[PDB]
Design a protein around this ligand. Sequence first.
Ligand SMILES: *[C@@H]1O[C@H](CO)[C@@H](O[C@@H]2O[C@H](CO)[C@@H](O[C@@H]3O[C@H](CO[C@H]4O[C@H](CO)[C@@H](O)[C@H](O)[C@@H]4O)[C@@H](O)[C@H](O[C@H]4O[C@H](CO)[C@@H](O)[C@H](O)[C@@H]4O)[C@@H]3O)[C@H](O)[C@H]2NC(C)=O)[C@H](O)[C@H]1NC(C)=O
Ligand SMILES: *[C@@H]1O[C@H](CO)[C@@H](O[C@@H]2O[C@H](CO)[C@@H](O[C@@H]3O[C@H](CO[C@H]4O[C@H](CO)[C@@H](O)[C@H](O[C@H]5O[C@H](CO)[C@@H](O)[C@H](O)[C@@H]5O)[C@@H]4O)[C@@H](O)[C@H](O)[C@@H]3O)[C@H](O)[C@H]2NC(C)=O)[C@H](O)[C@H]1NC(C)=O
Ligand SMILES: *[C@@H]1O[C@H](CO)[C@@H](O[C@@H]2O[C@H](CO)[C@@H](O[C@@H]3O[C@H](CO)[C@@H](O)[C@H](O)[C@@H]3O)[C@H](O)[C@H]2NC(C)=O)[C@H](O)[C@H]1NC(C)=O
Ligand SMILES: *[C@@H]1O[C@H](CO)[C@@H](O[C@@H]2O[C@H](CO)[C@@H](O)[C@H](O)[C@H]2NC(C)=O)[C@H](O)[C@H]1NC(C)=O
Ligand SMILES: *[C@@H]1O[C@H](CO)[C@@H](O[C@@H]2O[C@H](CO)[C@@H](O)[C@H](O)[C@H]2NC(C)=O)[C@H](O)[C@H]1NC(C)=O
Ligand SMILES: *[C@@H]1O[C@H](CO)[C@@H](O)[C@H](O)[C@H]1NC(C)=O
Ligand SMILES: [Zn+2]
Lengths: 196, 597
Amino acid sequence: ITNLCPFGEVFNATRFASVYAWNRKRISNCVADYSVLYNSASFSTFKCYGVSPTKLNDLCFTNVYADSFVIRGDEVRQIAPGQTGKIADYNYKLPDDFTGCVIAWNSNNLDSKVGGNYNYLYRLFRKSNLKPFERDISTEIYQAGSTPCNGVEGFNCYFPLQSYGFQPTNGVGYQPYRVVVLSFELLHAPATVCGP
Amino acid sequence: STIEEQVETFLDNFNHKAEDLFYQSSLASWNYNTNITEENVQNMNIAGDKWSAFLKEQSTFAQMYPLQEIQHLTVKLQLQALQQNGSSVLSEDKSKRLNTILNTMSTIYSTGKVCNPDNPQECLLLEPGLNEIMANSLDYNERLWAWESWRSEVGKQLRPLYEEYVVLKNEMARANHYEDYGDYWRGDYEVNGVDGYDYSRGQLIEDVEHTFEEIKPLYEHLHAYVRAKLMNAYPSYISPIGCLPAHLLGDMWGRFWTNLYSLTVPFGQKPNIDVTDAMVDQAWDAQRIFKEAEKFFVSVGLPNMTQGFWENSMLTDPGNVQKAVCHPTAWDLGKGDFRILMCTKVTMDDFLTAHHEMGHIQYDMAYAAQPFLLRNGANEGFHEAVGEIMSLSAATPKHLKSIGLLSPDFQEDNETEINFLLKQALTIVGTLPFTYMLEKWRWMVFKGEIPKDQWMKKWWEMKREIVGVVEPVPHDETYCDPASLFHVSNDYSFIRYYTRTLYQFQFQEALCQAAKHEGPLHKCDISNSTEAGQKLFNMLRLGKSEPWTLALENVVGAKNMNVRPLLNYFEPLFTWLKDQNKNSFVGWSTDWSPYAD
Ligand SMILES: *[C@@H]1O[C@H](CO)[C@@H](O[C@@H]2O[C@H](CO)[C@@H](O[C@@H]3O[C@H](CO[C@H]4O[C@H](CO)[C@@H](O)[C@H](O)[C@@H]4O)[C@@H](O)[C@H](O[C@H]4O[C@H](CO)[C@@H](O)[C@H](O)[C@@H]4O)[C@@H]3O)[C@H](O)[C@H]2NC(C)=O)[C@H](O)[C@H]1NC(C)=O
Ligand SMILES: *[C@@H]1O[C@H](CO)[C@@H](O[C@@H]2O[C@H](CO)[C@@H](O[C@@H]3O[C@H](CO[C@H]4O[C@H](CO)[C@@H](O)[C@H](O[C@H]5O[C@H](CO)[C@@H](O)[C@H](O)[C@@H]5O)[C@@H]4O)[C@@H](O)[C@H](O)[C@@H]3O)[C@H](O)[C@H]2NC(C)=O)[C@H](O)[C@H]1NC(C)=O
Ligand SMILES: *[C@@H]1O[C@H](CO)[C@@H](O[C@@H]2O[C@H](CO)[C@@H](O[C@@H]3O[C@H](CO)[C@@H](O)[C@H](O)[C@@H]3O)[C@H](O)[C@H]2NC(C)=O)[C@H](O)[C@H]1NC(C)=O
Ligand SMILES: *[C@@H]1O[C@H](CO)[C@@H](O[C@@H]2O[C@H](CO)[C@@H](O)[C@H](O)[C@H]2NC(C)=O)[C@H](O)[C@H]1NC(C)=O
Ligand SMILES: *[C@@H]1O[C@H](CO)[C@@H](O[C@@H]2O[C@H](CO)[C@@H](O)[C@H](O)[C@H]2NC(C)=O)[C@H](O)[C@H]1NC(C)=O
Ligand SMILES: *[C@@H]1O[C@H](CO)[C@@H](O)[C@H](O)[C@H]1NC(C)=O
Ligand SMILES: [Zn+2]
C-alpha cells in the first residue's frame, strides 16, 4: 500500500489530551518505519516491552494504536507494566505483561504557560483501580464518608478531577511530559500495518 | 471508612490542591523581594490572602476529625497542623492591619536610606552603603555616624510599628492557646506524644540558658582579647575594663565580629587566611563563588543545583533601578523551584555565605519527596545548621589551598592554626551572646516582662550585662534599635542561630568520624567523602517526619543539644587566649560608657 504512517499526526499534535481521558488513534492501512521514531532522538524515555524494536520493524500487524496524553515528569515512571501510583491506579493502567512501547519527552516549552496552564487534568480519586486500558471520565463526587454528598463538594466529599499546574519555572519533576503508548494487535483479519 | 482512612484521604486531597496555591504565594513573594514596587506588594498581598483563606477553609474541615483517634504519628502530626486556626482568628480589620504593618517594616528595612549631613544629595542604603562602612571603616566618627543615623532615622520609624506589631502578634498567639508570641515561636522545637523524646517549649529556655553558662568563659577571654587589640586600634575611645562600643564591632549591630580579624589577627606575618584578597586578585565573580559551592556539595555525593536554580536566582544586586531585599535568603517555592537571593560581593564572607545558603537549598531538595506538610527542617536550628557544617569545612586552610585561594607553598603551622581558630571564633563564638541576648529581649517583650515604657532602657542594660557591649550614644524611648536588624523587623525567630551553633559541631563531630579524619576537629574538611554526605543526607530526606530529638540521635547519638563539641573545637584557642590575657583585665563593668553622665 506504501502509505507512510501518520506518526507526525500524533507525536507533533498541536494539543494533547488530559491523562484521565487519554486519546487513542488507530493506525491502519499504512507502512510503519519504526526506526525513524527512535532516530528522531528527541525523546527522553523510549522503552519497549514484549518485543524488540530492531525485530519490530520487520513485522506485520492487523492494527496499531497510539495512546497520547500528558502527565508530570516524575509520574512518567508509572507508564510501565506493573506500576502503582496516582496515574496507574486511576488514569492509565498498563497490563503487567505488555507488548508495546512507551515514549515520552519533555513538553515544558509547549504545554506550560506563564501564570500556569490548568487545562490538563488528572483523576485523583476512584472507588477501585483501573483495569488495563480502562478509561474513566465520570464526574460524580467521590464520597469518603457514611454521609451522602448531594452532588456537591464538601466535608469528606471531593470532586474527583484535579488540575495540573504547569509554569515554566517548575522543577523537572513537576514539568509537563508528553506520553505516547504504542499498542499492537493481531486479529483473525488481514494485516494492515507492516514495516519495509 | 474508618476515621484514620478518611483523614488520609483528606490530607491527600489537601496535599494536591495545596501545592499550586502555595507556589503562587511563593512566586508573588519572590517578585516583591526581588523588586519592591507598590504593585508587587498588592499582588503579593493577594496571593497570600488567597492561600490564607484556603487554610482557614481546610482548617474548618480538619477540626472536624477527632485528633486522638489517629494512630500513626506521622499522619497525626499533619492532621494536627491543619487544625491550627493560625491567623484566621484575627478579625478581618486586625488581620489586614497586621499584614500592612509587616509589609511596611519589610520595605523600610531594605529601602530606608540615610543622607550625608555635609551633602544631603548623597544618600546611602543599608546594603551596600552602610554595611560597607561598618565592615571596613577605621574612623570612629564615620562608624559612629553610620551606626547612629541608621538607628535614629530608620529605627525611630520602626518603633510605632513594632509597638502595634507586638500587640497583634500577641493577640493571634494567645488565641491559639500559647502564652505569648514568644511561646508560639518556641513551639517549633516542641515534641509531643513520643515517650522519652518529648520536648516542652519551656525546656528550650532551660537548655539555652544552661548551655550558655559554659560558653561565658570562652567568650569573656575572646572579649578581653579583642578589647586589648581594639585599645590600640581606637586609641582614646576604649576603656580597659569597659564594654565594647557597639559601632566598633565589625558590622552594623555587632552580630559577627568577623571583620575585626584585620585588627585582631594574632600573627600578621603568616599568610592570610582571609582569602578576600586572593578572590579579588584572581578576579572571582559571584558565578565563580556559587560554582565553587556547587562543586563542593557534589564532592560528597549531593546533586547539582537544578537548571531552574541557575536560571531564576538573583545572585547580584540588580542595580540602582530595581529595589531588592539584599538579605541572603534561600527559597523553596515548592513545585521543584529552588532559588537563592543574595547581593553577592567578592569576599570570603560572601564565599562562605554562598556555601551556607546553598546548604540550605540541599536540605530543601533532600526532603522534596515528603508529603507537603512535612517538607521542612526538623527544627529551625537544623535548617540553619546544614550550611554551617559546610562553612566549617570550606573555611579550613586545607580546603582553601585545595581550591587555589591559598598559595600552594603555604603549609600549616601552629601560628596558622591560631590565626584560623581566632577568625572562626570571631564569627561563631561572638554571635552566641549577641544572639541569646536579642532573643531574650523579645521573649520578655512578648511575655510582657518589659513594659512599653522601658524597651530601650532594658535593651541596653542587657547589652552591657550579657554581650559586654555599650551604646556610644544614649537612646531614649523614641528609638527601637532591635527593629534595626533584619530578623526583628522582618518577623523571623532569632533563637535558630543559637541552637544551630551548638548543632553544627555535633554534626561535624559525627561526620569527621564518617570520613575517619584523624586529628583535631578544626582540620576536618569533609570533601570527597561520599561516606560523610550519605550520612548527612539520610537525615535530610526525613524533613520534619521525625522529631528532631530522634533524628539528632540518629547521627550524633544525642537526644538533646550539647556544647561539648563546640568547646572542644575552640579548645586550643581557649588555652591560648588565657595566656595572652594574663596581663589584661577579663570581664567588664556595666558602668563605663563612652559618653557623658
Ligand atoms: C577532592 O578531590 C579532587 C579531585 O581529585 C581534588 O582535586 C585534585 O587536586 C590535585 C592536587 O591539588 C590535582 O592534581 C594535580 O596537582 C598538581 C600539583 O602539582 C604537584 O605538586 C608537586 C610538584 O609541583 C608534586 O608533589 C605533585 O605532582 C603534585 O600533584 C597540579 O599542578 C596539576 O595541574 C595540572 O593539570 C594539567 C594536567 O597535565 C596541566 O596541563 C596543568 O598545566 C596543571 O599544571 C594537577 O591537577 C588534581 O588534578 C585535582 N583534580 C581535579 C579533578 O581537579 C581535591 O584537591 C580534593 N580535595 C580535598 C579537600 O581532598
Ligand atoms: C518590578 O516590578 C514592576 C511592577 O510595577 C515592573 O514594572 C512593570 O513592568 C511591566 C512589564 O511587563 C509593565 O506591565 C506592562 O504594561 C503595559 C501597559 O499597557 C497599557 O496599555 C494597554 C493598552 O492595550 C492596557 O491594556 C494596559 O493595562 C490596562 O488594561 C489591563 C486589562 O487589559 C488592566 O489589567 C490594567 O490594569 C490596565 O487597566 C495599559 O494601560 C501592558 O501592555 C503590558 O502587557 C504589561 O502588562 C508595567 O507597566 C510596569 N509597572 C510600572 C511601570 O509601574 C518592573 O518591570 C519589575 N522589574 C523587573 C526587572 O521586571
Ligand atoms: C515532527 O516534526 C519534525 C519537524 O518539525 C519532524 O522532523 C523532520 O523530519 C524530516 C524527515 O523527512 C526531516 O527532513 C529531512 O531534511 C534533510 C535536510 O537536508 C533532507 O535531506 C532529508 O531527506 C529529510 O527530508 C526534517 O529536517 C526534520 N525536521 C526537524 C526540525 O528535525 C518529525 O519527523 C515529526 N515527527 C514525526 C513523527 O513525523
Ligand atoms: C478556631 O476558631 C474556631 C472559630 O469557629 C473555633 O471553633 C469554635 O470553638 C468554640 C469553642 O470550642 C465554639 O464556641 C464555636 O462554636 C466554634 N466554632 C463554630 C463555628 O461553632 C476553634 O475552637 C478555634 N480553634 C481552637 C483550637 O479552639
Ligand atoms: C554538574 O554541572 C557541571 C557544570 O555544568 C557538570 O560539569 C560538566 O560535565 C560535562 C559532562 O559531564 C562536561 O562535558 C563539561 O565540560 C563539564 N563542565 C562544564 C559544563 O562547565 C557536571 O558534570 C554536573 N554534575 C552532575 C552530577 O550532574
Ligand atoms: C605546635 O604545638 C606543639 C604541641 O606539642 C609543639 O610541640 C610544637 O612546638 C608546635 N609545632 C610547630 C611549631 O610546628
Ligand atoms: Zn541560613
